[PDB]
Design a protein around this motif. Structure first.
Motif, PDB file in Angstrom:
ATOM      1  N   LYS A 155      -0.884  -2.954  16.163  1.00  0.00           N
ATOM      2  CA  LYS A 155      -2.213  -3.456  15.866  1.00  0.00           C
ATOM      3  C   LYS A 155      -3.173  -3.130  17.001  1.00  0.00           C
ATOM      4  O   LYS A 155      -3.141  -3.755  18.056  1.00  0.00           O
ATOM      5  CB  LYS A 155      -2.151  -4.951  15.565  1.00  0.00           C
TER       6      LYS A 155
ATOM      7  N   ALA B 121      -8.772  -8.911   4.790  1.00  0.00           N
ATOM      8  CA  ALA B 121      -8.533 -10.026   3.893  1.00  0.00           C
ATOM      9  C   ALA B 121      -9.635 -11.052   4.124  1.00  0.00           C
ATOM     10  O   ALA B 121      -9.634 -11.774   5.131  1.00  0.00           O
ATOM     11  CB  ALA B 121      -7.139 -10.606   4.120  1.00  0.00           C
TER      12      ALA B 121
ATOM     13  N   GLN C  67      -8.266  -6.024  10.518  1.00  0.00           N
ATOM     14  CA  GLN C  67      -7.242  -5.528  11.419  1.00  0.00           C
ATOM     15  C   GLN C  67      -7.108  -4.019  11.287  1.00  0.00           C
ATOM     16  O   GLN C  67      -7.192  -3.473  10.173  1.00  0.00           O
ATOM     17  CB  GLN C  67      -5.888  -6.137  11.085  1.00  0.00           C
TER      18      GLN C  67
ATOM     19  N   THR D 190     -11.065 -11.425   7.682  1.00  0.00           N
ATOM     20  CA  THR D 190     -10.096 -10.989   8.663  1.00  0.00           C
ATOM     21  C   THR D 190      -9.961  -9.468   8.591  1.00  0.00           C
ATOM     22  O   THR D 190      -9.534  -8.961   7.558  1.00  0.00           O
ATOM     23  CB  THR D 190      -8.753 -11.658   8.354  1.00  0.00           C
TER      24      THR D 190
ATOM     25  N   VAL E  47       0.846  -1.185   0.000  1.00  0.00           N
ATOM     26  CA  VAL E  47       0.000   0.000   0.000  1.00  0.00           C
ATOM     27  C   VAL E  47       0.884   1.239   0.000  1.00  0.00           C
ATOM     28  O   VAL E  47       1.964   1.255   0.582  1.00  0.00           O
ATOM     29  CB  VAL E  47      -0.959  -0.048   1.207  1.00  0.00           C
TER      30      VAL E  47
ATOM     31  N   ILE F 132      -5.039   2.818   9.969  1.00  0.00           N
ATOM     32  CA  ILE F 132      -5.473   2.151   8.766  1.00  0.00           C
ATOM     33  C   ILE F 132      -6.247   0.898   9.118  1.00  0.00           C
ATOM     34  O   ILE F 132      -5.847   0.108   9.974  1.00  0.00           O
ATOM     35  CB  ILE F 132      -4.262   1.890   7.857  1.00  0.00           C
TER      36      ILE F 132
ATOM     37  N   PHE G  15      -4.548  -0.807  12.360  1.00  0.00           N
ATOM     38  CA  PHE G  15      -3.206  -0.479  12.833  1.00  0.00           C
ATOM     39  C   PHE G  15      -3.065   1.016  13.032  1.00  0.00           C
ATOM     40  O   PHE G  15      -3.509   1.812  12.193  1.00  0.00           O
ATOM     41  CB  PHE G  15      -2.110  -0.899  11.858  1.00  0.00           C
TER      42      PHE G  15
ATOM     43  N   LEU H  85      -7.410  -2.613   7.499  1.00  0.00           N
ATOM     44  CA  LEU H  85      -7.084  -3.583   6.472  1.00  0.00           C
ATOM     45  C   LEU H  85      -7.936  -4.821   6.606  1.00  0.00           C
ATOM     46  O   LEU H  85      -8.257  -5.283   7.705  1.00  0.00           O
ATOM     47  CB  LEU H  85      -5.614  -3.956   6.623  1.00  0.00           C
TER      48      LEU H  85
ATOM     49  N   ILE I 211       0.642   5.198   0.877  1.00  0.00           N
ATOM     50  CA  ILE I 211      -0.143   6.077   1.716  1.00  0.00           C
ATOM     51  C   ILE I 211       0.350   7.475   1.444  1.00  0.00           C
ATOM     52  O   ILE I 211       1.515   7.789   1.693  1.00  0.00           O
ATOM     53  CB  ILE I 211      -0.015   5.713   3.201  1.00  0.00           C
TER      54      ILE I 211
ATOM     55  N   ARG J 295       4.336   0.377   2.103  1.00  0.00           N
ATOM     56  CA  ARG J 295       4.495  -0.714   3.027  1.00  0.00           C
ATOM     57  C   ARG J 295       3.952  -1.984   2.415  1.00  0.00           C
ATOM     58  O   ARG J 295       2.899  -1.957   1.780  1.00  0.00           O
ATOM     59  CB  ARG J 295       3.750  -0.409   4.328  1.00  0.00           C
ATOM     60  N   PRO J 296       4.579  -3.155   2.701  1.00  0.00           N
ATOM     61  CA  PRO J 296       4.020  -4.437   2.299  1.00  0.00           C
ATOM     62  C   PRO J 296       2.678  -4.711   2.973  1.00  0.00           C
ATOM     63  O   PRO J 296       2.523  -4.480   4.171  1.00  0.00           O
ATOM     64  CB  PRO J 296       5.115  -5.472   2.760  1.00  0.00           C
ATOM     65  N   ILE J 297       1.751  -5.294   2.216  1.00  0.00           N
ATOM     66  CA  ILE J 297       0.489  -5.739   2.772  1.00  0.00           C
ATOM     67  C   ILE J 297       0.156  -7.107   2.215  1.00  0.00           C
ATOM     68  O   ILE J 297       0.682  -7.492   1.174  1.00  0.00           O
ATOM     69  CB  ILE J 297      -0.620  -4.722   2.431  1.00  0.00           C
ATOM     70  N   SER J 298      -0.798  -7.764   2.856  1.00  0.00           N
ATOM     71  CA  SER J 298      -1.503  -8.890   2.271  1.00  0.00           C
ATOM     72  C   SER J 298      -3.016  -8.710   2.385  1.00  0.00           C
ATOM     73  O   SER J 298      -3.759  -9.674   2.604  1.00  0.00           O
ATOM     74  CB  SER J 298      -1.055 -10.171   2.936  1.00  0.00           C
ATOM     75  N   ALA J 299      -3.486  -7.464   2.232  1.00  0.00           N
ATOM     76  CA  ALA J 299      -4.899  -7.149   2.413  1.00  0.00           C
ATOM     77  C   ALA J 299      -5.571  -7.014   1.051  1.00  0.00           C
ATOM     78  O   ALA J 299      -4.898  -6.610   0.114  1.00  0.00           O
ATOM     79  CB  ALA J 299      -5.005  -5.862   3.204  1.00  0.00           C
TER      80      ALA J 299
END
Lengths: 6, 363, 6
Positions: B98, B84, B89, B87, B50, B80, B91, B82, B52, B64-68
């Motif tokens: 978190k 998935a 979350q 799931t 992502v 933020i 942050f 996020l 920002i 930043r790396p994400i997996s969302a």
């Protein structure tokens, strides 16, 4: 319904 | 000399100048929950990230790396959300922490911040609100009405007191884009299905009333044409006269047979409604009467996301090219525009006094 | 599993 009457 | 305009445009940013790939400038990958941040999901290498953009410091974005599958920034803070699938979350970015996490029963297919501290979650079957306070978990607000089944969900919003909730979807029916809304009353626990494309709530204090009215404003292109409705929701605060409901036309030119409303923001500083269409028209309406003050084509490009522009009590949006653009009332021009170009001294005088604007010293 | 790496 009848929340509003358009 | 060039005609005075009742609105002012301003280009804030071109996202392509920050090296955002146009493939990622679109409704599913770029979110703008407020005028403070833009988040863009991108894949650079095999790594999902992502980006920002802090609108106060836009030349120094963070990646930043994400997996969302989705990322939405809090309207006021560098917090933020996020998700998935199921799931969720939250942050705090600067704390690298978190704050909160939750796993839903059902996939969240749409979500949006509806306040400084509450996220709304839409599943295939229901709508929930999730407060960031304490250890709050998501609370189901209402079950989705069958008229939104199969729709692409495009918006969710509430009135200021979170007593009137509005879910909006679209779909193609008989070769046109049809809007389906679900209005829900928290106090009555009842829904009403309404055909509509874009909407907003607003607070408006009528002259002579001690309390603000809560207004529901929506625009629709129906089979029979474009309409804008402004209507009070709920019984008037005791003491108040009821707000008389307005229904006005929303013009589409003959060459825009396939256009329809996509975004609405209301300025409570000026008591005006900004409406943007899919294919790039801007309309300005008076909130009190529904009178159309102004229409123009910004461009050919679709503006797919908007937010209130706090500094100007206007509207800020992003179009598919990655232009970040705002429109607001031009405070020095609007009253003479209404008097001289619309030939509406009545409206001009009312707005001048109502919103403390200059220009009605003459007509 | 964090959804972002800060």
């Amino acid at each position: 319904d009848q929340l509003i009457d358009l | 000399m060039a005609q005075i305009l009742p609105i002012r445009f301003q280009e804030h940013l071109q996202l392509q100048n920050l090296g955002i790939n146009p493939a990622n400038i679109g409704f599913s990958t770029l979110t703008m929950e407020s005028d403070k941040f833009i988040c863009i999901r991108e894949k650079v290498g095999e790594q999902a990230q992502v980006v920002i953009i802090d609108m106060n410091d836009p030349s120094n974005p963070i990646r930043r790396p994400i997996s969302a599958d989705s990322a939405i920034m809090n309207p006021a803070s560098k917090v933020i959300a996020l998700k998935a699938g199921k799931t969720l979350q939250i942050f705090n970015i600067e704390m690298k922490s978190k704050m909160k996490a939750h796993t839903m029963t059902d996939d969240v297919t749409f979500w949006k911040w509806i306040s400084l501290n509450t996220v709304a979650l839409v599943t295939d079957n229901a709508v929930y609100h999730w407060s960031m306070e304490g250890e709050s978990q998501p609370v189901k607000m209402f079950d989705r009405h069958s008229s939104l089944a199969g729709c692409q969900i495009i918006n969710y919003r509430t009135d200021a007191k979170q007593k009137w909730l509005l879910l909006t979807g679209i779909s193609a029916q008989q070769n046109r884009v049809v809007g389906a809304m679900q209005l829900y009353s928290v106090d009555r626990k009842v829904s009403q299905p309404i055909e509509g494309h874009a909407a907003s709530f607003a607070q408006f204090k009528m002259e002579g009333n001690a309390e603000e009215s809560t207004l529901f404003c929506f625009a629709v292109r129906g089979q029979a044409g474009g309409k804008l409705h402004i209507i009070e929701v709920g019984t008037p605060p005791t003491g108040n006269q009821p707000f008389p409901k307005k229904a006005v036309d929303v013009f589409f030119p003959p060459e825009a047979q396939n256009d329809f409303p996509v975004a609405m923001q209301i300025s409570e500083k000026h008591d005006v409604v900004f409406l943007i269409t899919k294919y790039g028209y801007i309309h300005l309406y008076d909130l009190e009467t529904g009178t159309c003050i102004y229409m123009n084509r910004i461009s050919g490009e679709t503006i797919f996301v908007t937010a209130p522009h706090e500094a100007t009590a206007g509207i800020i949006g992003v179009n598919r090219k990655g232009q970040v653009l705002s429109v607001c009332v031009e405070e020095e021009n609007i009253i003479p525009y209404i008097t001289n170009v619309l030939q509406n001294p009545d409206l001009a005088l009312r707005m001048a006094v109502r919103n403390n604007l200059a220009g009605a010293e003459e007509l």
